[PDB]
Amino acid sequence: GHRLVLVLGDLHIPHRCNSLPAKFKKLLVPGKIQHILCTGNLCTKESYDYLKTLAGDVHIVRGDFDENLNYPEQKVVTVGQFKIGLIHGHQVIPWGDMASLALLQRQFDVDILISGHTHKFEAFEHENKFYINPGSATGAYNALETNIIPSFVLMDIQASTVVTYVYQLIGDDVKVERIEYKKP
Amino acid sequence: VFPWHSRNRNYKAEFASCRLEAVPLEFGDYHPLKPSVRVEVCKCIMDAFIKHQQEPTKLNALLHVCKTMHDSVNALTLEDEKRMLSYLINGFIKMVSFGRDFEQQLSFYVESRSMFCNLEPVLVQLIHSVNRLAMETRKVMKGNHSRKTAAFVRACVAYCFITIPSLAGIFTRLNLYLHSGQVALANQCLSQADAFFKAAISLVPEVPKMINIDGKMRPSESFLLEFLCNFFSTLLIVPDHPEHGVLFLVRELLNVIQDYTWEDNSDEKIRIYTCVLHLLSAMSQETYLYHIDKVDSNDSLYGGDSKFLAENNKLCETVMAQILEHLKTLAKDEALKRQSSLGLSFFNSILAHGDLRNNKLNQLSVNLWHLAQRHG
């Protein structure tokens, strides 16, 4: 049994980017995605409607610039055997700190923590817990980085194994990487 | 009084050890996604343009249409119509791109600001697009600014500084001060970044209890907590101007939050103090977790000088003293639920950042754990 989750965030349409990269839209076809977890900063209803055309279950958290202030600050969604924590990450002091995120993984009692304010992609296992920072799909700028690479994560969950396919657009080519995670 | 110490953190080594090794995919390998009053005419024109012009252009007729549409805004204009008009004008603005001619783009934006003054969302989009323009100039000239574009990026930052106060939204104002300050601080405009941060701090004491959200009045406590957390995370990179005391903006924000009018039935102020512990502990390290391209943050500016580290430690001790005072007042208030909640949060903070090797902080942590378990 395969469950597909699209980990996305920091689109910043149209505050910092007009749209997603050209190739990503071609790759993201409707029907192949079951859940969509967004770290936030879509900033418009248009990106939310675009996500609604890609899957049925669409969980979005509040960014630091999202227009809809009713999106939850943090969320816990159970897909397969895995509980996943979703938060934008700008609450975290400092941004992207390991301990400051382990605190959230303790609070939520959660298996995967997704947080993406720092637009650089990351994926690390700390204290037998999985942390994914999917980066910015549109490559939106931040003061923290010089060369932002558009990226998004796609988790295939089956029983206890999550295979994470990470899509990054370098130059004009979409590289994909495989990350293996197994819950003890 | 229990002092504080910072657990040494080697962010490079920690990330290197805990990072998951990904195996790249070659072609063939499987990845899942492998195959005047007649505003109606103005709306009709703008809809056609936004729906059937998908490439940027290098205006006057569309500008006149937008002026006619925007001039209809008065005291009798509803919020829904203002939202629609702002959407249409932003759709017009998005497609006007002068490419590598940055100066003409900024001229277009200043003209737009002088033309669409009433509709706030257009102004927000203009600030965001000017910030994008400055960052795009940085990206094109690869950080190594030329003498010519230094003035241009300073002009963009000044445009943000003068335009943000014209907004009415309190939290939009705070977040745009913070973001525009970060944008300025990515282009070696230290003095204007400090002004942006000071403006945000000075504007913090104005946020009320109830804020408008989709037409409904909701408490602003959680939103203020989020903004203050964002600001504290931002202050890690900000250089300290030598003409002031150490951690000047951090201390100013702490004073502001100390004097802020918090609700009597509220304990979020102590939560924010618990958060300040995080920022100080991170700021006390040898090299900071994240940096700007060429701005000497306090990590290299002070170089971890014993005086600066001691000042950070003393500020940590003061914040902890405040938190412990509130905890004791909670015990005297007999509402033990909030006491246990804050004790859990504080113990978690100490475990996250505090140097547990030190006996004095360890005893405080053990006492906090036992206090939390003493009342479920």
Chain B residues within an 8 Å CB radius of A169: none
What is the number of other CB atoms lying within 10 angstroms of the CB of residue B262?
17
Instruction: Report the candidate in B210, B230, B331 with the shortest Cα–Cα distance to residue A92.
Output: B230
Domain boundary among B165, B187, B216: B165
List the end-to-end C-alpha distance of chain B, in Å, as a whole number.
26
Can you say which residues of A are annotated as belonging to the binding site? 10, 12, 41, 64, 88, 117, 119
Domain boundary among B165, B180, B213: B165
Domain boundary among B148, B165, B182: B165
Same domain, B281 and B353: yes
Report the residue from B19, B25, B288 with minimal CB separation from A178: B25
Same domain, B277 and B151: no
Same domain, B243 and B341: yes
Rama region for A61: left / alpha / beta (φ>0; ψ in -120 to 50; rest): beta
Domain count, chain B: 2
Amino acid of residue B375:
H
Q: Is residue B341 less than 8 Å (CB to CB) from chain A?
A: no
Asked whether residue B309 is assigned to any structural domain, the reply reads: yes
Q: Which domain holds residue B138?
A: 57-70+80-165
Per-domain residue ranges for chain A? 3-182
The tokens for A26 are 């071609």
Same domain, B230 and B155: no
Same domain, B111 and B229: no
Resolution of the coordinates, Å: 3.2
Same domain, B135 and B269: no
Provide the 3-class DSSP secondary structure of residue A112: strand
Contact call for residues B292 and A143 (beta carbons, < 8 A): yes
Same domain, B234 and B375: yes
Chain B residues within an 8 Å CB radius of A177: 22-25
Nearest chain A residue to B35 by CA distance is A27
Same domain, B238 and B144: no
The DSSP call for residue A156 is: E
Same domain, B236 and B374: yes
How big is the A-B interface in CB pairs under 8 Å? Answer: 136
Contact call for residues A15 and B125 (beta carbons, < 8 A): yes
A146 and B19: CB-CB below 8 Å?
Answer: no
Report the residue from A94, A102, A165 with minimal CB separation from B289: A94
Contact call for residues A103 and B277 (beta carbons, < 8 A): no
> What distance separates the 2 farthest-apart alpha carbons in chain B?
76
CATH architecture of A3-182: 4-Layer Sandwich (3.60)
Q: Is residue B145 less than 8 Å (CB to CB) from chain A?
A: no
User: Buried (b) or exposed (e) across A44-76, using 16+ Cβ within 10 A?
Assistant: beebbebbeebbeebbbbbbbbbbbeebeebbb
Same domain, B336 and B235: yes
Asked whether residue B293 is assigned to any structural domain, the reply reads: yes
Contact call for residues A116 and A134 (beta carbons, < 8 A): yes
Asked whether residue B351 is assigned to any structural domain, the reply reads: yes
* Rounded Cα distance, B87 and B95, in Å: 13
Nearest chain B residue to A15 by CA distance is B128
* Rounded Cα distance, A170 and A114, in Å: 23
Q: Which residues pair with A181 in a beta bridge?
A: A162
- Contacts with A, B 149-188, CB within 8 Å: 175, 179, 182-183, 185-186
Mutation to test the A interface, candidates B9, B17, B23, B31, most A Cβ within 10 Å: B31
A175 and B135: CB-CB below 8 Å?
Answer: no
In the sheet where A35-38 sits, what is the strand order? Answer: A57-60, A35-38, A3-8, A151-158, A161-170, A173-182, B23-24
Asked whether residue B201 is assigned to any structural domain, the reply reads: no
